[PDB]
Amino acid sequence: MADQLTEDQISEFKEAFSLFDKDGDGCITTKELGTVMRSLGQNPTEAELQDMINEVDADGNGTIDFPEFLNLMARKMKDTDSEEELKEAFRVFDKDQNGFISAAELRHVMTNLGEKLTDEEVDEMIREADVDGDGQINYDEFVKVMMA
Ligand SMILES: [Ca+2]
């Protein structure tokens, strides 16, 4: 996500927040959160609802206002994006979509990415990330090497 949000993104988040804010006073209370939680098939304890609210209540006034709500969703958005970007990238490399990146696929995709590696380089790159040593890179392995 990054930082600055677009007007449409903000306006949407406001519509959402509007659902949580059952009595529309501009702030979400534990009670209002519980109502929303339950309706989704959950049953948080009064202690959990207070934690959830408290963990998002930056100014400590007891409730969640729009900017507090927005900052939470923005962090969740960026987390999702980062993860989704890792998944997209893996898909690009996994040319045959079998769940693994092979040396041949790494060489191919790489070249087509403006990166031409030699045979030695290709194999070393695979080995460097190949934790279980089966000769190919699975998703967990790709993630591990990407976030490092
Ligand atoms: Ca309210």
Ligand SMILES: [Ca+2]
């Ligand atoms: Ca607050």
Ligand SMILES: [Ca+2]
């Ligand atoms: Ca593959």
Ligand SMILES: [Ca+2]
């Ligand atoms: Ca492997």
